[PDB]
Design a protein around this ligand. Structure first.
Ligand SMILES: [Ca+2]
Length: 223
Protein backbone atom coordinates (compact mmCIF):
# COMPACT_ATOMS: atom_id res chain seq x y z
CA UNK A 1 0.00 0.00 0.00
CA UNK A 2 1.39 3.37 -1.07
CA UNK A 3 0.16 6.44 0.78
CA UNK A 4 -1.73 4.53 3.44
CA UNK A 5 -1.54 4.25 7.17
CA UNK A 6 -0.71 1.62 9.80
CA UNK A 7 -3.97 -0.22 10.40
CA UNK A 8 -3.30 -1.28 13.94
CA UNK A 9 -2.85 -4.81 15.14
CA UNK A 10 -5.75 -7.11 14.28
CA UNK A 11 -8.04 -4.28 13.21
CA UNK A 12 -8.67 -5.93 9.91
CA UNK A 13 -9.53 -9.43 11.20
CA UNK A 14 -10.43 -11.00 7.87
CA UNK A 15 -7.00 -10.15 6.33
CA UNK A 16 -4.76 -13.12 5.76
CA UNK A 17 -1.17 -13.49 4.56
CA UNK A 18 -0.44 -16.30 2.13
CA UNK A 19 2.96 -17.74 2.97
CA UNK A 20 5.21 -20.13 1.01
CA UNK A 21 8.30 -19.58 3.14
CA UNK A 22 7.60 -15.83 2.92
CA UNK A 23 4.60 -13.54 2.45
CA UNK A 24 3.58 -13.41 -1.20
CA UNK A 25 -0.11 -12.34 -1.33
CA UNK A 26 -3.05 -11.33 0.70
CA UNK A 27 -6.45 -12.96 1.01
CA UNK A 28 -9.73 -12.64 2.83
CA UNK A 29 -11.26 -15.14 5.26
CA UNK A 30 -14.89 -15.81 4.22
CA UNK A 31 -15.75 -18.64 6.70
CA UNK A 32 -13.84 -20.80 9.07
CA UNK A 33 -12.46 -23.04 6.34
CA UNK A 34 -12.18 -20.82 3.19
CA UNK A 35 -10.12 -17.88 1.93
CA UNK A 36 -10.69 -15.80 -1.23
CA UNK A 37 -7.64 -14.44 -3.07
CA UNK A 38 -6.51 -13.59 -6.58
CA UNK A 39 -5.96 -16.37 -9.14
CA UNK A 40 -2.68 -14.81 -10.11
CA UNK A 41 -1.54 -15.63 -6.57
CA UNK A 42 -1.91 -19.37 -7.14
CA UNK A 43 0.94 -21.64 -6.18
CA UNK A 44 1.32 -25.03 -4.38
CA UNK A 45 2.55 -25.19 -0.82
CA UNK A 46 0.46 -22.40 0.65
CA UNK A 47 0.25 -21.83 4.38
CA UNK A 48 -2.53 -19.39 5.38
CA UNK A 49 -1.55 -17.04 8.18
CA UNK A 50 -4.47 -15.56 10.11
CA UNK A 51 -4.42 -13.05 12.97
CA UNK A 52 -1.25 -11.40 11.66
CA UNK A 53 0.01 -7.85 12.27
CA UNK A 54 3.82 -7.94 12.06
CA UNK A 55 4.40 -10.80 9.63
CA UNK A 56 7.98 -11.16 10.87
CA UNK A 57 7.27 -11.48 14.62
CA UNK A 58 5.07 -13.97 16.52
CA UNK A 59 2.89 -11.63 18.52
CA UNK A 60 0.37 -14.10 19.97
CA UNK A 61 -2.83 -14.02 17.90
CA UNK A 62 -1.69 -15.91 14.84
CA UNK A 63 -3.16 -19.14 13.44
CA UNK A 64 -1.02 -20.87 10.77
CA UNK A 65 -3.06 -23.41 8.74
CA UNK A 66 -1.85 -25.17 5.57
CA UNK A 67 -4.13 -25.17 2.47
CA UNK A 68 -5.73 -28.47 1.56
CA UNK A 69 -6.97 -27.33 -1.86
CA UNK A 70 -6.73 -24.36 -4.23
CA UNK A 71 -9.58 -23.65 -6.81
CA UNK A 72 -8.81 -21.11 -9.48
CA UNK A 73 -11.81 -19.68 -11.23
CA UNK A 74 -12.86 -21.78 -14.25
CA UNK A 75 -12.52 -18.82 -16.65
CA UNK A 76 -9.36 -17.19 -15.25
CA UNK A 77 -7.22 -15.77 -18.08
CA UNK A 78 -3.72 -14.94 -16.86
CA UNK A 79 -3.00 -12.78 -19.94
CA UNK A 80 -5.95 -10.35 -19.36
CA UNK A 81 -6.45 -11.03 -15.65
CA UNK A 82 -10.13 -11.54 -16.37
CA UNK A 83 -11.71 -13.54 -13.54
CA UNK A 84 -8.77 -12.97 -11.16
CA UNK A 85 -10.19 -14.94 -8.21
CA UNK A 86 -9.40 -18.15 -6.42
CA UNK A 87 -10.61 -20.02 -3.38
CA UNK A 88 -8.30 -21.70 -0.86
CA UNK A 89 -9.59 -24.33 1.61
CA UNK A 90 -7.86 -24.72 5.00
CA UNK A 91 -6.83 -28.23 6.19
CA UNK A 92 -8.45 -27.42 9.54
CA UNK A 93 -11.04 -24.81 10.51
CA UNK A 94 -9.80 -21.52 11.92
CA UNK A 95 -10.84 -20.65 15.43
CA UNK A 96 -12.92 -17.55 14.98
CA UNK A 97 -12.60 -14.73 17.50
CA UNK A 98 -12.42 -10.90 17.64
CA UNK A 99 -9.06 -10.90 15.85
CA UNK A 100 -9.66 -13.70 13.33
CA UNK A 101 -13.04 -13.14 11.71
CA UNK A 102 -14.76 -13.75 8.40
CA UNK A 103 -15.93 -11.01 6.08
CA UNK A 104 -19.39 -11.21 4.54
CA UNK A 105 -19.89 -11.59 0.79
CA UNK A 106 -21.85 -8.82 -0.94
CA UNK A 107 -25.47 -9.09 -1.64
CA UNK A 108 -25.27 -6.35 -4.44
CA UNK A 109 -22.46 -4.65 -6.32
CA UNK A 110 -21.07 -1.46 -4.89
CA UNK A 111 -21.46 1.78 -6.69
CA UNK A 112 -18.89 4.30 -7.82
CA UNK A 113 -18.25 6.76 -4.97
CA UNK A 114 -18.56 4.23 -2.22
CA UNK A 115 -15.83 4.36 0.24
CA UNK A 116 -13.79 1.20 0.92
CA UNK A 117 -10.87 -0.15 2.94
CA UNK A 118 -7.97 -1.75 1.11
CA UNK A 119 -5.22 -3.45 3.12
CA UNK A 120 -2.01 -5.44 2.76
CA UNK A 121 1.69 -5.99 3.37
CA UNK A 122 2.88 -4.90 -0.07
CA UNK A 123 5.32 -2.24 -1.27
CA UNK A 124 4.86 1.20 0.23
CA UNK A 125 6.82 3.02 -2.50
CA UNK A 126 5.90 3.90 -6.10
CA UNK A 127 9.64 4.08 -7.05
CA UNK A 128 11.92 1.67 -5.36
CA UNK A 129 10.94 -0.85 -2.74
CA UNK A 130 10.11 -0.87 0.97
CA UNK A 131 8.00 -3.69 2.37
CA UNK A 132 6.38 -3.01 5.72
CA UNK A 133 6.23 -5.70 8.30
CA UNK A 134 2.88 -4.42 9.86
CA UNK A 135 -0.39 -4.26 8.01
CA UNK A 136 -1.12 -1.07 6.04
CA UNK A 137 -4.53 0.32 5.19
CA UNK A 138 -5.97 2.78 2.65
CA UNK A 139 -9.41 4.31 2.49
CA UNK A 140 -10.37 4.89 -1.13
CA UNK A 141 -13.46 5.33 -3.27
CA UNK A 142 -14.70 3.15 -6.09
CA UNK A 143 -14.30 5.00 -9.42
CA UNK A 144 -16.82 5.07 -12.20
CA UNK A 145 -16.61 2.46 -14.89
CA UNK A 146 -16.14 5.17 -17.56
CA UNK A 147 -13.25 6.66 -15.68
CA UNK A 148 -11.74 3.15 -15.23
CA UNK A 149 -11.99 2.42 -18.97
CA UNK A 150 -10.71 5.76 -19.89
CA UNK A 151 -7.67 5.16 -17.67
CA UNK A 152 -7.02 1.70 -19.15
CA UNK A 153 -8.28 1.53 -22.70
CA UNK A 154 -9.09 -1.93 -23.98
CA UNK A 155 -8.36 -3.62 -20.63
CA UNK A 156 -11.29 -3.27 -18.20
CA UNK A 157 -13.86 -6.11 -18.28
CA UNK A 158 -17.20 -6.38 -16.56
CA UNK A 159 -15.33 -8.38 -13.84
CA UNK A 160 -13.10 -5.46 -12.87
CA UNK A 161 -13.47 -2.08 -11.16
CA UNK A 162 -11.10 0.75 -10.38
CA UNK A 163 -10.68 2.30 -6.98
CA UNK A 164 -8.38 5.05 -5.68
CA UNK A 165 -7.31 8.49 -6.75
CA UNK A 166 -6.68 9.69 -10.25
CA UNK A 167 -4.30 12.29 -8.97
CA UNK A 168 -1.87 9.62 -7.78
CA UNK A 169 -0.14 9.06 -4.46
CA UNK A 170 -2.47 6.50 -2.82
CA UNK A 171 -2.90 2.92 -4.14
CA UNK A 172 -2.33 -0.75 -3.51
CA UNK A 173 0.87 -2.26 -4.89
CA UNK A 174 2.90 -5.35 -5.48
CA UNK A 175 2.59 -7.71 -2.51
CA UNK A 176 -1.00 -6.53 -1.78
CA UNK A 177 -2.40 -8.80 -4.54
CA UNK A 178 -5.21 -11.05 -3.46
CA UNK A 179 -6.15 -8.86 -0.49
CA UNK A 180 -9.46 -7.27 0.37
CA UNK A 181 -11.40 -4.26 -0.70
CA UNK A 182 -14.22 -3.96 1.91
CA UNK A 183 -17.10 -1.49 1.58
CA UNK A 184 -19.83 -1.16 4.24
CA UNK A 185 -18.78 -4.47 5.87
CA UNK A 186 -18.80 -6.51 2.60
CA UNK A 187 -15.98 -7.92 0.47
CA UNK A 188 -16.39 -6.08 -2.83
CA UNK A 189 -12.96 -6.41 -4.36
CA UNK A 190 -9.71 -8.31 -4.61
CA UNK A 191 -6.43 -6.51 -5.26
CA UNK A 192 -5.63 -7.48 -8.87
CA UNK A 193 -3.50 -5.20 -11.00
CA UNK A 194 -2.52 -1.63 -12.07
CA UNK A 195 0.22 0.13 -14.05
CA UNK A 196 2.91 0.80 -11.51
CA UNK A 197 1.51 1.97 -8.21
CA UNK A 198 0.05 5.31 -7.18
CA UNK A 199 0.66 6.88 -10.58
CA UNK A 200 -1.43 9.74 -11.93
CA UNK A 201 -4.33 8.49 -14.07
CA UNK A 202 -3.57 4.85 -13.33
CA UNK A 203 -5.76 3.76 -10.44
CA UNK A 204 -5.86 0.29 -8.93
CA UNK A 205 -7.87 -2.42 -10.68
CA UNK A 206 -9.81 -4.89 -8.52
CA UNK A 207 -11.72 -8.13 -9.17
CA UNK A 208 -15.44 -7.44 -8.89
CA UNK A 209 -16.44 -9.94 -6.17
CA UNK A 210 -20.19 -9.47 -6.46
CA UNK A 211 -20.08 -11.20 -9.88
CA UNK A 212 -18.70 -14.33 -8.19
CA UNK A 213 -21.00 -14.88 -5.21
CA UNK A 214 -22.92 -17.71 -6.83
CA UNK A 215 -19.67 -19.43 -7.86
CA UNK A 216 -18.17 -18.97 -4.39
CA UNK A 217 -21.22 -20.35 -2.58
CA UNK A 218 -21.66 -23.33 -4.90
CA UNK A 219 -17.98 -24.14 -4.72
CA UNK A 220 -17.90 -24.07 -0.92
CA UNK A 221 -21.11 -26.16 -0.78
CA UNK A 222 -19.45 -28.99 -2.74
CA UNK A 223 -15.77 -28.91 -1.72
CA1 LIG B 1 3.06 -12.13 13.43
Amino acid sequence: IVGGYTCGANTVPYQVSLNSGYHFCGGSLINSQWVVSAAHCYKSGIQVRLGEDNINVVEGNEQFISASKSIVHPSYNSNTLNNDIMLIKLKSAASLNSRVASISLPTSCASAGTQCLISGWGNTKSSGTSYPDVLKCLKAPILSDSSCKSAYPGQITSNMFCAGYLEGGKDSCQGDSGGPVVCSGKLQGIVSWGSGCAQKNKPGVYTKVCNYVSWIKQTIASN
